[PDB]
């Protein structure tokens, strides 16, 4: 059942992690599947890190999100220690307190996009849709191909996520509530909601749409 990836880290910093994996009869892949059970992260002083794609996807997969100092210290102690000891609980934008991956690995079938419907209306950067979509897919939404393809009315709240600035020949992003009836929010909504594991009330990043 045991496997994982790395993020942030240098080559040398990769190496202790090979030695560490190679030790504990483990498996190690570059990029991330649903089988991956750990994401090992670069930090500093104590347990606060950075936003890396792999970083959300270990919360969105509500998997084990151990900080690097799990390894320089499972080596500097001849055995593998505990993961609740050395877990991430922050980043450069999202806190020092929060412990995102907690309510994540803990709060499972009650999942934060509880019957939502999400459309990642393009285009975005540093993040292929597939993987942003797959992120919300993992948080419990259900991705819509195009807007017009929504399933409106009964039950489900709808939302449109777009990356602000990454719009090429733009303001083509200001005519959207003018191309349907669902809250338009920045990639920001989505990221901040996964990481914190607080399904943000969206009242705050909601690009203004033309009546």
């Amino acid at each position: 059942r045991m496997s994982m990836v790395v993020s942030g880290l240098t080559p040398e910093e990769f190496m202790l992690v090979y030695k560490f994996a190679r030790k504990h009869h483990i498996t190690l892949t570059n990029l991330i599947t649903e089988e991956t059970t750990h994401v090992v992260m670069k930090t500093d002083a104590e347990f606060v890190c950075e936003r890396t794609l792999k970083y959300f996807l270990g919360i969105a997969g509500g998997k084990w999100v151990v900080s690097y100092f799990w390894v320089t210290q499972s080596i500097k102690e001849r055995k593998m220690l505990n993961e609740h000891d050395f877990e991430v609980r922050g980043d450069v934008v999202n806190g020092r307190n929060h412990q995102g991956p907690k309510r994540a690995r803990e709060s499972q079938d009650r999942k934060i996009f509880r019957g939502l419907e999400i459309c990642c209306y393009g285009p975005f950067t540093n993040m292929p849709t597939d993987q942003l979509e797959w992120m919300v897919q993992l948080c419990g939404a259900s991705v819509v191909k195009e807007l017009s393809s929504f399933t409106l009315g009964t039950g489900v709240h709808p939302i449109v996520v777009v990356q602000p600035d990454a719009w090429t020949e733009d303001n083509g992003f200001h005519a959207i509530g003018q191309m349907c009836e669902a809250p338009v929010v920045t990639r920001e909504w989505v990221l901040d909601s996964v990481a914190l594991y607080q399904c943000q009330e969206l009242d705050t990043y909601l690009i203004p749409q033309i009546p």
């Binding site: 993020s7 500093d44 890396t52 792999k54 540093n126």
Partner: peptide
């Protein structure tokens, strides 16, 4: 375009 995810030296 800062950007984010995976780098090095004077962090």
């Amino acid at each position: 375009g800062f950007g984010e995810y995976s780098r090095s030296p004077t962090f």
